[PDB]
Design a protein around this ligand. Structure first.
Ligand SMILES: O=C(c1ccc(O)c(C(=O)n2cc3ccc(OCCC[PH](c4ccccc4)(c4ccccc4)c4ccccc4)cc3c2)c1)n1cc2ccccc2c1
Length: 415
């Protein structure tokens, strides 16, 4: 089954009318005159076009048309073509000076455009060779929506071969909310469920997605679907893998098209065990986004350990290492402090199997060496405190020492 709609149905009966770009549109259209980015942009607009249309037909409500996004390559003409069937542009929009303009030209020696607005409006050609002048003529045979043809620069002819284009689409445009055909071959779309409302995402749907974003074969031991608009637009999903970890990677999205796939320092360093996905509508800022996500995660765990102390304990043995690096490698004491509220430790208050949290040691901090309750339960330094009043805290882990020393205190407590 081959299915694409892209062919030359157009002609310019009349004759074009050259224009000038405004004084500014020039000075960026020449500083520009990394590299694969532009299709991600062009796919975006071609969707956004279609969304704006769909949203307007249901308004009144006569049955929807075909709504696709197509991409065509030409080996012998050296071209690439993207035609959505969206709401389209009118003649005025065509002349009024908005991302995709500068990326298409960053690869094109010359762009060709066939737009036509949905309002039953004529169709127009739009030519430009990246110099200050763009012709625009009424054109015959234009199909509703917007075709974009690009005769690629001499040196950027790579995007002209199909074997090179597929990865760019699979990478960035795997979640566009309308069908997307490369050469009429349907390109996959998974559902971007991180956009949805946390209540409407079933449990089975999270799993299917965890299995994708993490390349795994199990379920997620925890799930966090953080959707909030107050600080920044975020539509996020977090998953912690179930079993014990043995040898960041949250993807980074903006309005369903990928920016960065292995987002480094989107999350802290001690949170590098989270997969899932952060999405925003905001394209140095990250040093604000990383800190605010850090808080929501710490929340989620402090409040898991409130929900179900057994699942948490299983997790804190599996992943307590990162939590320690968190406090040794974090520099600002309140962040270290807020991570310690996740540490659980064995202590004199119950037999082996007592995880006390330091937070609860507020009954009255002393701590001892490792690793077994026997070398702890008879240590001349321990028993010195067993004849003494205070309750000691038993670390039983070796890197716990450096954690609890680099965490130089807790809640202004000696530690
Ligand atoms: O990239 C394209 C292209 C390709 C195919 C198309 O078929 C269209 C098209 O006809 N569109 C109509 C739209 C209408 C709205 C829209 O959405 C974008 C503009 C409105 P926005 C926004 C504002 C600022 C930045 C981004 C979006 C939004 C953003 C995010 C989510 C939802 C809406 C909004 C906000 C509030 C109310 C109403 C609209 C996108 C639209 C795309 C454009 N180029 C590049 C060219 C270079 C040279 C020559 C020809 C070229 C064509």
């Amino acid at each position: 089954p081959l299915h694409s709609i892209i062919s030359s149905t157009e002609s310019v009966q009349g004759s074009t009318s050259k224009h000038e770009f405004q004084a500014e549109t020039k000075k960026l259209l020449d500083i520009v005159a990394e590299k694969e980015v532009f299709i991600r942009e062009l796919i975006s607009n071609a969707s956004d076009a279609l969304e704006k249309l769909r949203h307007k037909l249901v308004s009144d409500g006569q049955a929807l048309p075909e709504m696709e996004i197509h991409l065509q390559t030409n080996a012998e003409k050296g071209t690439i073509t993207i035609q959505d069937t969206g709401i389209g542009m009118t003649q005025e929009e065509l002349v009024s000076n908005g991302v995709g303009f500068y990326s298409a030209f960053m690869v094109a020696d010359r762009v060709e455009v066939y737009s036509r607005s949905a309002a039953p409006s004529l169709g127009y050609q739009w030519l430009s060779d990246g110099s200050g002048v763009f012709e625009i003529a009424e054109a015959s045979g234009v199909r509703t929506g917007t075709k974009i043809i690009i005769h690629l620069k001499s040196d950027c002819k790579e995007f002209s071969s199909e074997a090179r284009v597929r990865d760019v689409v699979t990478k960035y445009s795997n979640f566009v909310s309308f069908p997307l055909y490369l050469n009429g071959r349907r390109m996959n779309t998974l559902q971007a469920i991180w956009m949805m409302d946390p209540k409407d995402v079933r449990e089975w749907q999270h799993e299917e997605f965890y299995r994708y974003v993490a390349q795994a074969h199990d379920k997620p031991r925890y799930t966090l679907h953080y959707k909030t608009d107050a600080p920044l637009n975020i539509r996020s999903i977090f998953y912690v893998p179930d079993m014990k970890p043995s040898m960041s990677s949250v993807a980074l999205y903006s309005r369903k098209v990928l920016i960065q796939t292995k987002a480094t320092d989107i999350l802290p360093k001690w949170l590098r065990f989270i997969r899932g996905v952060v999405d925003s509508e905001d394209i140095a800022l990250i040093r604000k986004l990383r800190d605010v996500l850090q808080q929501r995660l710490i929340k989620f765990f402090i409040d898991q350990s409130k929900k179900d102390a057994e699942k948490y304990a299983k997790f804190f043995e599996d992943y307590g290492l990162f939590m320690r690096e968190g406090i040794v490698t974090a520099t600002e004491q309140e962040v270290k402090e807020d991570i310690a509220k996740l540490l659980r430790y064995e202590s004199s208050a119950l037999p082996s199997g007592q995880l006390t949290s330091l937070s609860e040691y507020a009954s009255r901090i002393y701590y001892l060496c490792a690793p077994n309750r026997h070398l702890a339960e008879h240590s001349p330094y321990y028993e010195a405190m067993k004849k003494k009043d205070t309750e000691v805290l038993f670390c039983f882990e070796q890197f716990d020492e450096l954690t609890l020393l680099h965490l130089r205190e807790f809640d202004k407590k000696k530690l």
